[model samples]
Target chain A: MTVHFIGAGPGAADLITIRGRDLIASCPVCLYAGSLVPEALLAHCPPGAKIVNTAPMSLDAIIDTIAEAHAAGQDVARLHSGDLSIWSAMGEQLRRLRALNIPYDVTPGVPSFAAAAATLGAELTLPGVAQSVILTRTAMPAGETLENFARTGAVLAIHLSVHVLDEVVQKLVPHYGEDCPVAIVWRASWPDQRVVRATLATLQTSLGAELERTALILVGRSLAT
Target chain B: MTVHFIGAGPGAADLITIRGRDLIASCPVCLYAGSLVPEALLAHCPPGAKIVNTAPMSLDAIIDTIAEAHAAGQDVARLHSGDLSIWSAMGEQLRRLRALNIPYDVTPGVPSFAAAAATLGAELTLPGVAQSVILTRTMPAGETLENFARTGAVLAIHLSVHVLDEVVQKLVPHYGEDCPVAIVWRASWPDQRVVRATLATLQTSLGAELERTALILVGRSLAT
Candidate 1:
């Protein structure tokens, strides 16, 4: 039995890769990231398919689900949002799958940062402006500092740290300055996607209560245009 | 009286955004970056459409072409390969179009580095391994060495610096002693696409004398 690892694309259900969409349609058992993946993507699954949401399930539980499906000779679709390789928490899944001896293949999707850029009609790498783009988070699981971003000098896309938007801006303001453009894309490409445009100085005022959850904060000079 | 800037979306012609494809098909006059844009994308235009290849043309020539199209009241489509914002040499074009009083809008496309990643079947950001992906290039006409990849802690995609493999070799060793490196020649959609050896140890041996004009150098620990 084969387990196809699929990237659900940037929040939008339709944006999932053609190969990923086909795999979901053919698989008998499907698992998706409940917090990010749209439900409509799973609508293409076969009628008899068993759908499991991995948001609440632990890593072990999710692996058990895949093992059960594989043992029963049923195909499994492990769905990840916004490109399985980047920040999708896929390394642990891959490691677990390997330990369980389940065969798997990965299919990529459009990352959220790229999709957010499309939604805003702004280029992350403008020719005369900035030619590089850096995709990173403010505080990683290991507690890395924001100083890493200051040294890069590329267009920056900061994710998964909405609660600390103010603190993030404080750190970025010194390097990028208060006038530098900043955009907070809430749930990019999804039907409820929200885009807030402001400068680093005004980010605190602009993003007061909006920083509750499920948001991608894009900080850089590119938003000024 | 207006100009529409469209992104051709990596190397694959069809991957161009739906909005970008639509604009190109409907416009009467189009100017495209002939050097990188695939010929098939231009097929969307009508038979009578006046399409000019901008590869050999100078920046002044390109601006003049758009101005003339606007004067004729024919909407112009400025086709840029692999997203308009990065490395498309679009800043000057936009400045000139604004000076000419031509109304314009930009349609973003899939960047080449993203296409390169897709071709490699590799993720630029792998959790626990490396959570960041840096899209950068070697110092060129308008690039700087200050931002030139310092250490190998981050995964990176280097574009348009094929002649400087020795420079890459010097910068990359600090990141990972045994990282996987792959060179994607014309990623996504059709002919002559090559995903060359990813061995970090054989960097010079694998990439020596390799000169595919439009290629991406992807370096990371995720190559298995």
Candidate 2:
């Protein structure tokens, strides 16, 4: 039985691709990250399908469920928030499936960065303004630094770093200047989607509160009005 | 009437979001970049709908069509290939629409790079290995070169397939000749093609067929 790793798109039921929706409808076993994926998408699941919220499950535990479904000759629709291309944690699961000989394929979806851009009605890449768009996160112990990405002068879509807006502004102000436009898009494409537009100098003050992980911070001149 | 700028997604008809598909069906005027957008997508348009292919049209001409639709009070679905956030030239159209007092909203789609990543069955962002994805095109004349390759992030290089050899030369210095690189041609399409190899041997692997429409993805994460 083959497993379909489907990207549920950025928090919108209708945003999911037709192929992804069909896979969810056909699969008897549906596993999704409950915290991020919208429950509205679960309606596409077949009747009596074994549905599991994998939010609290560890990597091994999630794989165990998939393995159990494999043993029963059942097709699985494993849903991850946003596209599989970025931060989907599909790599670790793919490695396990490979060892276990569980055949799988992927369906890409609208990444949150793209959804946020749509919400802002802005193009991440503008001719002669910002030629590149860099999708990155805040500092990780062994990963590329936000400061390093700032120097490229590309549009920066920083993920899981909204809580550190003050630091992000500090690092980017030197490169993008104080008046450069930035946007904080929270739960992009969702019902309560909130967009706060500000300059690199004024983002933290404009936000006026601590933002959570679901928010995306976009910085660049391309965001200019 | 609000003009809907929809992303047709990467190649596959079924890859389009349900919202995008429905919008195409409802709009009385449908304009698309014919060369890149699938013909299957046009089937979504209602019977006898005004379907115009914008591939051979100029920017001003495309805007003129949208203007006509606005004057006619018919909602238009302006379809661009891939996500409007990248390389879709929606910025220029939006500027024109705003000047003409036309309202518009965007519906983002699955970018070709994301589709290519799925085709590879690989994640663009892997923990510790590569934490960033740089989406850029090759430098045009008189543009300052920032050298994103220096950052060592996963790169989705667009619109440079014709200069694959030159791109390789510039990339070899920062990414090293041994770095894994992949060229995905027409990602998500029925005839999608891919070439995977190290920077040192990608030229040999590509063998003389210079693709005009392909995305060059270079990074250590691609190997994953």
lDDT of each: 0.69, 0.87
Put down candidate 2 lDDT per residue, B119-201, tens digits, no spaces: 99998787778888888877332223335766778888885566777878887887789999898888888878888999999
Q: Residue-wise lDDT of candidate 1 within B21-127, one digit each (tens)?
A: 77888899988887578888888987799989888999888888887887789998889877665667766676677687788877666666666665554555654
lDDT of 2 at A166: 73
Give the top-scoring candidate (lDDT). Answer: 2
TM-score to native of every candidate shown: 0.78, 0.96
Clashing residue pairs in candidate 2 are none
Assign candidate 1 its CAPRI class. acceptable
Question: Which residue pairs in model 1 clash with each other?
Answer: A125-B85, B152-B175
Which parts of model 2 have CA positions greater than 4 angstroms off?
A139-143, A209-214, B139-146, B207-210
Q: Where's the lowest-lDDT run of ten residues in candidate 2 chain B?
A: B138-147
Which candidate comes out best when scored by TM-score? 2
Q: After superposition, how far is residue B125 of candidate 1 from its true place, in Å?
A: 2.7
Q: Write model 2 residue lDDT over A170-212, tens digit each, in one string.
A: 8788888999998988889999788889998887778765446
State the DockQ, from 0 to 1, for candidate 2.
Answer: 0.63
TM-scores of the candidates, chain A only: 0.92, 0.94
